[PDB]
Amino acid sequence: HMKKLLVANRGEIAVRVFRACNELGLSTVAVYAREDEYSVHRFKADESYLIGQGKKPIDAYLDIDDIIRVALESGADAIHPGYGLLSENLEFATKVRAAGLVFVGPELHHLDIFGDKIKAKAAADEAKVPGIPGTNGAVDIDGALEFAKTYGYPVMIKAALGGGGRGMRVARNDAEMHDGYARAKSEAIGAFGSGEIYVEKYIENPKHIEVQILGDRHGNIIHLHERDCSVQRRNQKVIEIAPAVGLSPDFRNEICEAAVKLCKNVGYVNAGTVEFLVKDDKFYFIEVNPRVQVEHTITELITGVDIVQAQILIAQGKDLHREIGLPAQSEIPLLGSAIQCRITTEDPQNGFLPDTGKIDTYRSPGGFGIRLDVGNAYAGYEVTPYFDSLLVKVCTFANEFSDSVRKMDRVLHEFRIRGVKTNIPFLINVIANENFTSGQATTTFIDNTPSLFNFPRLRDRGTKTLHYLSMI
Amino acid sequence: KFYFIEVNPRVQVEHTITELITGVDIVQAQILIAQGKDLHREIGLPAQSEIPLLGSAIQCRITTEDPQNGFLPDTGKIDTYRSPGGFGIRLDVGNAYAGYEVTPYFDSLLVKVCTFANEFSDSVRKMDRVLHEFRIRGVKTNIPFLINVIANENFTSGQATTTFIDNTPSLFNFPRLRDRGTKTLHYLSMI
Amino acid sequence: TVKADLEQKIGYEPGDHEVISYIMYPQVFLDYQKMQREFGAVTLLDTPTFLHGMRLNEKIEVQIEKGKTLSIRLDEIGEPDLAGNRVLFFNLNGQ
Amino acid sequence: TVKADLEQKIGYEPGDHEVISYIMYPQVFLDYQKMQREFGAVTLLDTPTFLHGMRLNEKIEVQIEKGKTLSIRLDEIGEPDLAGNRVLFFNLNGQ
Numbered sequence: 001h002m003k004k005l006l007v008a009n010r011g012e013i014a015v016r017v018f019r020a021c022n023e024l025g026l027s028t029v030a031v032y033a034r035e036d037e038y039s040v041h042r043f044k045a046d047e048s049y050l051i052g053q054g055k056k057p058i059d060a061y062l063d064i065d066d067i068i069r070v071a072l073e074s075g076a077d078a079i080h081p082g083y084g085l086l087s088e089n090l091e092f093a094t095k096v097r098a099a100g101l102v103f104v105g106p107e108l109h110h111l112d113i114f115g116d117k118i119k120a121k122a123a124a125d126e127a128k129v130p131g132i133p134g135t136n137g138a139v140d141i142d143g144a145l146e147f148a149k150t151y152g153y154p155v156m157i158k159a160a161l162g163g164g165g166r167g168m169r170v171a172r173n174d175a176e177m178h179d180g181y182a183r184a185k186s187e188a189i190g191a192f193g194s195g196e197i198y199v200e201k202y203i204e205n206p207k208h209i210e211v212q213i214l215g216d217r218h219g220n221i222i223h224l225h226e227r228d229c230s231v232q233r234r235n236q237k238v239i240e241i242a243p244a245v246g247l248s249p250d251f252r253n254e255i256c257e258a259a260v261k262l263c264k265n266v267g268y269v270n271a272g273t274v275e276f277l278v279k280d281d282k283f284y285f286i287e288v289n290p291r292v293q294v295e296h297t298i299t300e301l302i303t304g305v306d307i308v309q310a311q312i313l314i315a316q317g318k319d320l321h322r323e324i325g326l327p328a329q330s331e332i333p334l335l336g337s338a339i340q341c342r343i344t345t346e347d348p349q350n351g352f353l354p355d356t357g358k359i360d361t362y363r364s365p366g367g368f369g370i371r372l373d374v375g376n377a378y379a380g381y382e383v384t385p386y387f388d389s390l391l392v393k394v395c396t397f398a399n400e401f402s403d404s405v406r407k408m409d410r411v412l413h414e415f416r417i418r419g420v421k422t423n424i425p426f427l428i429n430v431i432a433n434e435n436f437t438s439g440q441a442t443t444t445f446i447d448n449t450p451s452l453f454n455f456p457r458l459r460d461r462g463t464k465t466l467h468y469l470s471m472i
Numbered sequence: 473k474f475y476f477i478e479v480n481p482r483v484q485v486e487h488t489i490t491e492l493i494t495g496v497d498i499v500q501a502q503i504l505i506a507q508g509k510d511l512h513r514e515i516g517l518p519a520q521s522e523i524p525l526l527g528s529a530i531q532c533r534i535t536t537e538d539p540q541n542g543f544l545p546d547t548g549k550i551d552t553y554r555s556p557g558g559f560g561i562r563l564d565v566g567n568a569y570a571g572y573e574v575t576p577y578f579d580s581l582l583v584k585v586c587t588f589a590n591e592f593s594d595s596v597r598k599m600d601r602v603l604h605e606f607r608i609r610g611v612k613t614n615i616p617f618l619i620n621v622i623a624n625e626n627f628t629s630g631q632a633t634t635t636f637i638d639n640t641p642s643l644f645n646f647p648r649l650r651d652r653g654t655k656t657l658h659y660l661s662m663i
Numbered sequence: 664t665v666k667a668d669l670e671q672k673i674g675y676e677p678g679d680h681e682v683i684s685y686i687m688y689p690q691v692f693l694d695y696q697k698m699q700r701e702f703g704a705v706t707l708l709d710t711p712t713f714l715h716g717m718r719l720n721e722k723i724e725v726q727i728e729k730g731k732t733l734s735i736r737l738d739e740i741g742e743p744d745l746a747g748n749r750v751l752f753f754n755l756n757g758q
Numbered sequence: 759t760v761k762a763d764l765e766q767k768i769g770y771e772p773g774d775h776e777v778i779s780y781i782m783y784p785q786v787f788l789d790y791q792k793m794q795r796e797f798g799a800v801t802l803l804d805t806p807t808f809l810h811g812m813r814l815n816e817k818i819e820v821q822i823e824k825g826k827t828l829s830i831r832l833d834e835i836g837e838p839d840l841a842g843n844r845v846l847f848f849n850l851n852g853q
């Protein structure tokens with residue numbers, strides 16, 4: 001009944017959904033902006049259409065009416081939002097479902113519940129999963145001071161709508177509480193507008209185990225396995241490892257069972273993840289992303305499952321354990337350990353600012369246990385500042401975590417991207433660290449290790465020789 | 473009734489599928505054995521009864537043999553190369569980059585791509601997607617022949633024999649491919 | 664018989680109109696089919712692009728299908744070699 | 759003090775010979791280090807390639823290291839654009 005799918009996204013995720021649809025036998029429709037006319041995902045689909053004419057490309061990709069019109073004109077049946085652009089927008093999903101098109105995502109009430117941190121916190125408190133001690137919701141300066149007076153320091157200011165180190169910052173004492181609350185309210189009314197704000201009890205050196213959740217409308221809800229995104233630089237995920245090798249198996253099972261029981265109580269459908277803050281055998285619910293993750297590839301590698309393909313099959317209305325054919329919860333395999341590094345144009349010698357320019361040299365590493373999800377990183381590609389800084393993400397999987405570390409080191413040394421400055425030496429430094437290899441990395445590991453910023457000089461004797469030859 | 477034929481005393485071309493289904497790096501184990509180490513104590517391989525079997529893996533070799541020319545190897549420049557990626561895909565490329573001049577001295581192999589999945593049907597679908605995603609222009613490849621072999625019902629069932637190829641004349645019916653990029657570029661350059 | 668001859672001469676089974684046009688113009692239809700196999704469907708280009716080709720550092724968009732648009736850009740025209748074959752450096756679909 | 763100044767000026771720890779060369783020729787050593795960071799070790803090229811550069815369709819082999827031999831071939835020299843930057847189409851290591 002569904003024979004054509006549209007992807008309202010760009011880059012790596014669009015080609016990932018294109019590959020999943022071509023494996024499933026569906027036709028693919030792509031959307032792109034004028035500044036994204038040279039992107040790889042435009043030419044990887046059967047049909048491509050220009051959206052958001054006359055607008056900036058970021059707002060062009062958020063044009064709900066233009067995407068809806070393209071999906072209706074092209075004859076598409078389903079719409080996959082991917083992640084990061086419209087996969088958590090309630091209005092876009094509501095318009096897609098009201099226009100007669102299938103939305104490859106959770107239902108509208110799921111988006112309403114998990115799109116705000118206050119409502120998600122209330123649902124988790126109803127669900128009897130151990131949350132984190134915080135305030136009752138939108139609190140002012142005096143309400144934030146009452147939390148410090150009753151519970152006790154340290155604390156942390158967090159917005160109820162921000163995401164990715166944007167509306168959250170640390171707080172220690174009374175005056176900087178006022179300064180941070182004022183700056184957070186200013187950033188909320190500036191970037192987003194009409195956003196709430198709370199203050200919660202801070203935890204020293206936690207971990208960031210995430211549990212991937214799959215579920216169809218027939219009532220079957222399954223967790224695939226856990227992850228470990230604890231390697232964070234200023235609350236931004238850098239390296240994600242799955243499964244959490246630094247944790248006990250029974251504790252990981254408890255975390256996964258808590259996540260699947262929360263999703264069963266809510267009644268979750270399609271793909272989604274639950275984040276937990278782990279510190280000394282105490283996990284705390286912090287968020288649910290109603291999305292497919294960028295770091296879902298390591299879960300795909302360790303569980304042997306296709307998350308995007310199962311997502312589209314669930315959106316088709318198929319049964320999880322009968323029509324998709326997925327095994328039962330107790331029979332889900334945990335084979336090996338997988339490590340994902342996301343190579344971006346953030347130059348670590350320039351304060352991790354994104355770099356732009358032409359990519360005059362690209363060479364991807366193959367071999368055993370290597371999986372590549374390349375975005376727009378081919379030779380001759382002109383990097384634009386409008387979009388994300390990601391070039392290519394690469395995942396290495398092996399039976400032993402040390403073998404995965406060695407494979408990732410070989411891949412990072414085999415990668416050759418020239419013309420733009422990348423964070424490959426930073427990834428090499430984090431990989432070579434002894435704290436990462438054991439698996440006991442916390443979210444403060446990057447900011448408390450100045451040894452990761454000592455990058456050795458590279459000769460680069462080919463580019464300079466060619467430059468001298470051209471000059472002469 | 474199984475019958476012995478011969479023993480190849482080397483690492484073979486198709487060791488990639490064994491690497492994928494067992495999770496054991498064959499070349500690394502070979503080098504470590506040549507170092508004099510132990511299989512189950514220094515290399516760290518598990519016991520024989522505990523060796524995993526992680527689904528089914530399929531490997532085909534993409535060569536410069538043209539199926540419309542009696543599978544004779546083709547030579548020339550490689551105008552386009554676009555290696556597919558994604559979940560469950562492993563590529564062992566040789567010399568197949570863009571602008572590479574194919575010489576008739578060496579082997580016809582360009583790229584050795586493999587697909588692995590829990591089910592054999594999923595591996596077949598992944599390999600079909602990979603074969604349709606591969607773009608090698610300038611030289612003629614056996615990709616349509618591989619697509620025809622993959623799409624056959626005997627291969628997907630898994631009961632293919634040694635005489636399966638020679639008794640299937642329907643595998644040589646290749647559809648016409650209208651490369652509207654290369655022809656348009658050729659006409660534009662000509663004018 | 665002429666339908667079978669046309670099918671064995673063009674490599675695929677023709678329709679009624681192709682057979683009729685082969686009857687009316689035998690050599691002209693064969694030349695048209697040969698240039699169709701060589702240069703492709705040149706009917707989709709713009710008229711100045713069809714006639715005068717391409718300019719240096721020029722971008723064109725060719726609609727080959729519904730939803731398919733070729734982004735052709737010419738970057739360099741090479742010098743002719745000893746064999747008389749120039750090399751043109753194109754940018755088809757960004758690559 | 760001059761060793762620390764040279765270390766912070768060039769970004770790496772210098773030897774005794776580098777320090778004693780910087781003392782006698784302050785500006786000349788800094789210019790040499792700037793050309794070292796820009797063009798690299800140009801002492802490994804042969805003298806005609808060092809002086810006159812490269813020719814059209816000319817293949818050279820540069821041994822930057824024992825076992826490492828670069829294969830450089832110049833294919834085309836592009837026309838200068840409005841900004842004045844020519845584009846040179848090289849074939850380094852076959853690519």
Ligand SMILES: CC(=O)SCCNC(=O)CCNC(=O)[C@H](O)C(C)(C)COP(=O)(O)OP(=O)(O)OC[C@H]1O[C@@H](n2cnc3c(N)ncnc32)[C@H](O)[C@@H]1OP(=O)(O)O
Nearest residue numbers: 361410413414416458459460461462463825826827828851
């Ligand atoms: C196959 C694998 O597992 S890769 C693991 C890492 N080992 C290698 O890559 C072996 C090749 N070695 C190298 O490329 C360099 O020594 C590296 C790894 C230090 C790269 O760092 P760089 O300083 O930027 O490269 P370097 O200046 O030393 O060499 C210049 C170029 O010569 C090339 N080169 C490298 N080895 C050789 C060789 N034996 N012959 C000719 N060219 C070579 C490299 O590709 C290198 O990159 P480039 O062409 O894009 O410019």
Ligand SMILES: CC(=O)SCCNC(=O)CCNC(=O)[C@H](O)C(C)(C)COP(=O)(O)OP(=O)(O)OC[C@H]1O[C@@H](n2cnc3c(N)ncnc32)[C@H](O)[C@@H]1OP(=O)(O)O
Nearest residue numbers: 018019022045046047048604605649650651652653731732
């Ligand atoms: C992500 C995946 O899984 S891709 C799997 C393969 N399927 C697709 O790529 C869908 C798009 N279709 C195609 O690329 C091809 O037409 C195929 C696969 C049907 C094969 O047909 P071919 O005869 O070999 O090539 P064709 O001339 O018809 O394609 C037109 C050209 O425009 C490109 N193109 C393809 N789709 C689009 C598009 N939506 N917009 C612009 N250009 C496109 C093609 O890459 C091709 O250029 P190429 O010679 O470098 O390959």
Ligand SMILES: Nc1ncnc2c1ncn2[C@@H]1O[C@H](COP(=O)(O)OP(=O)(O)O)[C@@H](O)[C@H]1O
Nearest residue numbers: 156162163164165201202203235275286287443
């Ligand atoms: N109370 C806390 N104690 C310590 N670290 C925290 C706390 N709250 C958030 N963080 C850190 O800030 C990041 C914010 O994550 P989260 O709010 O769950 O998602 P998002 O960043 O998308 O809003 C987390 O990765 C976590 O490491």
Ligand SMILES: [Mg+2]
Nearest residue numbers: 164275286287
């Ligand atoms: Mg989060």
